[model samples]
Target: AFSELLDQVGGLGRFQVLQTVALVVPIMWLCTQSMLENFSAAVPSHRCWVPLLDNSTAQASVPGALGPEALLAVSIPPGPNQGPHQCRRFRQPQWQLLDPNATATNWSEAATEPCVDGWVYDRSTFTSTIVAKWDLVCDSQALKPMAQSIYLAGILVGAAVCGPASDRFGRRLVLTWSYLQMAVSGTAAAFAPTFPVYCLFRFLVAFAVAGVMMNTGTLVMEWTSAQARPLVMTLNSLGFSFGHVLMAAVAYGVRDWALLQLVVSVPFFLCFVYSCWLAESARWLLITGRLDRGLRELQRVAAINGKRAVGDTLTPQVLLSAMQEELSVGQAPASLGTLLRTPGLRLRTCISTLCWFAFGFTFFGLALDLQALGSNIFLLQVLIGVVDIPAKIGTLLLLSRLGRRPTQAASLVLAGLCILANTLVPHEMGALRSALAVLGLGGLGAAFTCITIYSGELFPTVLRMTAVGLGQMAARGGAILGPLVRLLGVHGPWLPLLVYGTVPVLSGLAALLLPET
Candidate 1:
């Protein structure tokens, strides 16, 4: 058996470990690009326009010295929540609100009009962002989330294509071209002049990352042994949290939105350089009947691990004989459609797809939600990153002791309970609510780590990449809905939490139906 063949060589070694780290570079890039959107699309505090005071000496001294703050106080009405109105203002300046000697009056009674002249923004937090650049607030606030959805839609498109293509050709070639696309598309997005163009470029970047998303992990896991897979998967999974940390730090250091985009996108080009040394998956070769290629990859792996394969062990005759022996046992061709045709595989595919969807929804929803709910977006991101470390470590320990099924099911249910707790908490307990929500977000982080490894283990080698891609397609679809779900707060704050909580709890229940992979 090929499993025995891998053991004949070194199953786990220095070569395997080094190659796994190198393969995870793209996963790190995927996480960085995903989180970058939040910072780049951030909307700072803003209000209706107030024209500058006349520069002429006749009018300058009275108003210019006091500034736009004095003018905006009178021009815009107080918001329903007690801040300056974001979209409307008095038809003309009502200077009485700013006068020291003015008597108490009902500012709400003042006549108002929509902001016809445009808006002014507070630039202290962000030098510029998509929201500020295109004025995507008030009525156009929908555009911000819409742009993110377009990117995720592009990821879904890539998921449908890249996985099937990787299986058709080879991992190396598909990954090479995908990295090149990511480099060009990500860098170009920063220079986009309009919101549509920005979304277009972002979609392109999303397409490239989606390719990295499915194939990189598959490439690493295929070369690794089943015994060591959980640890290898855990390490590669942590690269995502590492990317989140880096994005927050860089986004904080470089406050300009365009420049920040450039910084994150430029690192992807390095993947192209490293692609030269990336070995083709020997497991993929054996399953596909490429005897010579399969033998050579195994030989390469053995040599690098300080072992040797000689004579019949990896000869063309032995390799071809092994391939025929396997086919004789009734293994089917590797096709995306085949995933649903086989009985055991069909069940695995259905459960994995739904599980991926639930995790993506809960994970991304909480990340975006905390940004809106927390006082400081940057600080919230950093805190989430910090909390994620211990969450993931806990997942790793639980996975080893309790095995995959219980750990995955428990973590997801725990996350749902956290979301429900946040909903039931009083609004006056702001700190308590934030803590519970962030802790829930951490639980989702742990679930993400578990399911990633579990899904890879669940699928057959012949269709691993394709299965992972389909799982990503379902998950990306859920992630696309996360931002739209945030808008549900208008109806009731608890609505979004209720939706997020229900999916994971049901997913945990469904998870019980899956065999312990």
Candidate 2:
């Protein structure tokens, strides 16, 4: 019955959903990781050159403009707090190199001596005229999270739109369209001429990411057997974590933020090409009234996978013959109205949406702020991701035993409380910090299970994928607020952490009022 819905206008069901997932997820993984460095670097401005002047011995002829001083020598403080970065004192401080830009002539009489202080350079090696740029664009030290939050803002918008577009129109149409835009935009952002333009491109990439992530669930559900569906989805989540690790590897190899994005965006071209080789899902075809085409497509899938079909090829004529034997038949196409029209579905969408939003706020927000949390970013990310592996496995086990609600509640409570406690723990206590990350991951894992699987069940089978998309939209929306919270939380040193800690708890409490299922 679902096979009719799964097939597309071209009856290419296998091609659309699975291809969309594979192409989209890996790119998103790469995009999220490297965006931190690109945006962080962009947070500061780039000065092509400086107003460095030669002020060594034999200083330039007397300057009689302000006073009777022969030369103006100024102090260059290590930072912006003391004085203007470009100014210098009128006279040299004995043998000291007070100015960053100084020539041998600036000093009265001295050997080609070693230079000291933040402004110093020896005439021999330093005179090679080293002018290194400092990271001072946004002029703020808190850069990593700022960059991450911006990208997530773009993603929030993307997630909101992609799923419905895919479901309403067709997955193939959405994936192909989004891929073209994403590839163009992501690559452009990688080489953007200005910071503002770069942010725009990031938004496009984020939008595509939502579409891609949603498709992963849609495809795996139909292609795999029912008994394996849950495990397959869990593995898909693990694949994202693997992508995270792969990104770290790619970044280590490339070492430049812009270069890393270029590396990521370029590969989508390959996916786009390969995607042409796929067929739509039979399940989608069955829902959309191309039942015979759906059967032919399934047989092809079985053949490619080297499995013989257990049944005969189906067509329009055969569908009627088969229908009488089957117990249930197709309902109307799953429209937006049906979601509201159906019983229990509205609650499902609402609860799932809330859970996703909360999950995005806590989880994606932490990823954005990882660098500023007073720990090693790379190591912390790797460790946090690793901890989720067991969390995911454990949740799969517990979900079977305890059902969804209790497991979800425990995980969320742990996530929120961990964030709250992390706020109190000083940076010096690495052990406590590590523990908090593990706790947080556990909750995040359960949130994924609750939001995704529940989304599938709450809606009718035809609209199951659409429901998932709506939830992701809520997530992206909530993620926009994640980094933004820091602005209000800036007053107290630990306020941001406290904010991160608090939201999930509210989300958890909100979950209890939802249907127990």
Candidate 3:
């Protein structure tokens, strides 16, 4: 009934087109922030900073005129590949090691010590990074990974809190607040004075990013008609893919970590200003029994769609009659518990949650191993982004022809199989292995796009945001767990891939249990 009302106003009309474009624009920046750590915290080639050799006067006083490279050769021991050792330096310079014909066996027993002074980083790629700024190397290296984990944790909490908040307060309010939060917190992180302060700000930024994601998705879903929903959602997904490629470009151009952070963040102030014009979900208002408010929003939308005459005729009584069935279900605010209180909702929630978990688990598990592709990071980012375009186009076809259930199940199962197949390919076959990995990654990307649309359709108006939130929380849980599961590789190289491959297959099968949207 509400969808019918939406059709009368302007189903997929100019207003919806404009609104979706407005919502999706911020998603690009959101993607950049989510993946910012890749460039901002990248580890550079480094070695122990030796005080004696690094000083020009000390090098000149030597008996022989040793160049800077020669001075470093005497001060730092050669690592396995004969490069200057990153974490170790000779206790005293070994002048004899500089001999042209010196054998490894002769200097193998030389005494070495941890870098007590500091380190020198190669800044050719990144002008600055967190790893270099705080010396997140050697014993301090653990903090780098921990910082990302904290950011992910913030996203998890954001989904849990903001989903419900949006449900209770309204999508537009939460989205506006999230935009403000993102702008302030993200800029704060750029100027953070210390590592902990940086981490704290990043956590808040991620939290706000999640809020933006949740509310934007809900708002888009509520406004769009069934016919236009999939396409609009795909556009949103494409925005994220474009963001991945755009981030690489921005990172390449900016070079400085702080400047890059600031660059991606400041645009949100514009987003916040414009998001004020976006209407609250009329469906949400109607279901909550605020018929007068819902009617006004609908009339506004109608006016925007050039249906002012029809919009003027709409009143509280007409809206009340139209949505009386839903209104009778009670205007009491929906809670998370309501999801499982009914069997129909329960099945949808459980299956969507599982599918989301599988998507995040494998999607991030593969994404975080970009180095394993043995390609330049920028090229890999571009390739991954490009793959999403075709994969989503294929998904759009599947969703349109075969319907949501089979498409969802097939994407997960196929993705799992591709990953599982990669494990069988020998490591020597780098080209084939990489191709398979990219294919699997594309499948995961398709599944992610599918679930976003599917979950939105499966859940009802009142509980929609909360249901998506719960699914997102589950996905984040899997994302947090994805890297940890790679630890299983210590026991056997195939163990982690095996788990990653198998879980999605099982989840795909579980998805089949869900009824078609």
Candidate 4:
């Protein structure tokens, strides 16, 4: 039956469309993850001279990494440095919330990390990343991961505003406007006059992010052939990874904050161009009673592919009814409310949100700390990016084999254990340290995959995107807290590792709360 419907749409299969949709989304979103570590990489200082910092103690509570200046100057046996590597670090004033209470708390917390005196390796023996520290940091990330959450909030708003609107109004139209808004707003945000202005504009960035992510998949699914979707989905699985690679290369070329934003925004304008030139989804047009547009689009697609819609005449009602039937019974009119209203969707929201929160927190928190620890920042960043591939591949395989719930639970549990072990591992044990690193990567990877895929499955088609978007919203909320957790001055003997690991443990428990799809 499913094959028969797909046959009408040029012999495309469901899996093929799903694959393409998956590939595009993750690649588009790699920026969010690939740059996670760099966001705080500037905590250290660049090459330095002989000077004293006004507040050495300021390093204690400041978010991001620590710098060389945090400690008193020391002499070392210099010379014979590795090749052309240069370390890089930067620093900027912390961004306090508008709320006076939060501001007071923020400052009080920040007082712990050495303020202006923080130093980092601005140049490295291998890459520009060494230990992140600084005085001249990128003010762009002054809010830390809160900025990410701010963007996610926009995504949440977009999902709410655009998801169903796309369905009811038209996929092409909603996508066109949303993508245009994103391109314009994101480009504008790159040039915002003030930090607060950037923050305000940043919300719109999320909306655009959500809009593109949610709608593009629908477009791909509509356009792709069926048999190819399964393997194509592999591309979807690689989207974020590919995006991470792309962003890394792009960032390497355009490291300046505003310039990077400018470069990234180019895609949005290109998206706008495509929007004006492209046709609406025939399936969507048929469903919405725009038979004429639907037939035209179908004909165009057939002509382009040198194939026909199989039927002599694809009347609007015929396609509409067929399209409706293709969706599982409960999937009509993809929705937000109905999805959450289902048996375990509300719980799913909380669990997936928390899991993503943990993913962001650990993936980012420790990453920030590495720069603070004054480790090889470039080496570490490279390691972090490379780590994601195995994580992703492992996740896809697990999902294919174990389905969603068990795979998620197992991955999260391992991540939690890794955090715990990082704290417990004797500093001298090289094997333990190596194991913990791998565990961190694996656990975080699994949890990320589970949250995204399971969220889609739990919600019927109407609400699948909404569920994912809302979960992203909540996860962003947690992202807002990530930097704060790092600056909480909560570390003790094994304090940092323990608290870091704690995030996933709680989240893993939360995962079981949702009804497995």
Clashing pairs in 1: none
Tens digits of per-residue lDDT for model 3 on 232-347? 77888899988878987887789999999999999999999988788999998998768778888898999999978999988887887778776776656577887679876776
lDDT of each: 0.79, 0.58, 0.83, 0.57
Per-model TM-score, in order, reads 0.88, 0.72, 0.87, 0.67
How many backbone collisions does model 4 have? 60
lDDT accuracy of residue 435 in candidate 2: 72
Which sections of candidate 2 miss by over 4 Å? 2-150, 289-295, 305-313, 320-352, 458-470
Pick by TM-score: 2 or 3, better one: 3
Off by over 4 Å in 1: 52-70, 96-110, 308-313, 327-330, 333-353, 403-406, 423-430, 453-472, 492-494, 509-517
Worst 10 residues of 4 by lDDT: 76-85
**Which portions of model 4 show Cα errors greater than 4 Å?**
1-5, 11-41, 46-149, 178-182, 189-193, 222-234, 253-255, 275-279, 309-312, 320-374, 423-435, 455-473, 490-497, 509-517
* lDDT of each residue in 446-484, candidate 4, tens digit only: 577666666666655566666666666666565555555
For residues 25-90, write the lDDT of model 2, one tens digit per residue.
Answer: 654454453334422342221111112234423333435332212222332222233322322222
How far does residue 516 in candidate 4 sit from its true spot (Å)?
6.5
lDDT winner: 3
Ranking by lDDT: 3, 1, 2, 4
- lDDT (C-alpha) at residue 419 in model 2: 77
Choose 3 or 4, whichever is better by TM-score: 3
